[PDB]
Amino acid sequence: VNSFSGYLKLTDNVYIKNADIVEEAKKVKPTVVVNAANVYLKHGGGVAGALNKATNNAMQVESDDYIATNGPLKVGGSCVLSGHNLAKHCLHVVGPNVNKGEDIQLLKSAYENFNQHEVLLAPLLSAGIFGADPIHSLRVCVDTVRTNVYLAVFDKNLYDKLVSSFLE
């Protein structure tokens, strides 16, 4: 149904909210929820772990079956799989992990995958333990994505810092 509410409008197509992506998926019922995935689709912690746990492990079982036949994804790449009880589809997107030496330039490619979907619920790519500068990831999102993206950032201090820096 894509019933997003309580979001700050950053541009004509980019919205942001201090919220848990899992709780947003449950209320909004989006056509697409984006997962901050790794190349082998192992959803053990962070955003991936929260989405997988909200599907009672159905996402991980489906992901293991995909990996068995198709092998790993590439950094900057993506894969559409079922969204289970959280969405119609889950778009698993691999952003670069700069804390593991991955190229930050690939973050533009990661966001480009959002342009295949009219409207998406998404986390801020490569933030958290992936180590990218969150203000830079927001700028790559604004500059790259043309479709409607609703960003859920589950940290009030980070949300306030991003909004303040964007309004400069």
Ligand X SMILES: CC(C)[C@H](Nc1ncnc2[nH]c(C(=O)NC3CN(C)C3)cc12)c1ccc2c(c1)S(=O)(=O)CCC2
Tell whether residue 133 is a contact of ligand X (CB under 6 A). Answer: no
If the CB atoms of residues 81 and 158 are measured against ligand X, the closer one turns out to be 158
Query: Which of the residues 15 through 54 are near ligand X (CB under 6 A)?
Result: 20-22, 36, 46-47, 50
Query: Looking at residue 66, what DSSP letter applies?
Result: H
If the CB atoms of residues 43 and 69 are measured against ligand X, the closer one turns out to be 43
Of 40, 72, 33, the C-alpha closest to 54 is 33
Of 154, 38, 35, the C-alpha closest to 86 is 35
Asked if residues 132 and 98 have their Cβ atoms less than 8 Å apart, the reply is yes
Of 7-15, 63-71, 111-119, 127-135, the window that binds ligand X (rule: CB under 6 A) is: 127-135
Strands 78-82 and 89-93: antiparallel
Distance of alpha carbon 130 from alpha carbon 83, whole angstroms: 23
Out of 128, 133, 142, 166, point to the residue binding ligand X (CB under 6 A).
128
Of 9-17, 25-33, 75-83, 146-154, the window that binds ligand X (rule: CB under 6 A) is: 146-154
Tell whether residue 158 is a contact of ligand X (CB under 6 A). Answer: yes
If the CB atoms of residues 22 and 32 are measured against ligand X, the closer one turns out to be 22
Footprint of ligand X (CB under 6 A): 20-22, 36, 46-47, 50, 123-124, 126-130, 152-155, 158
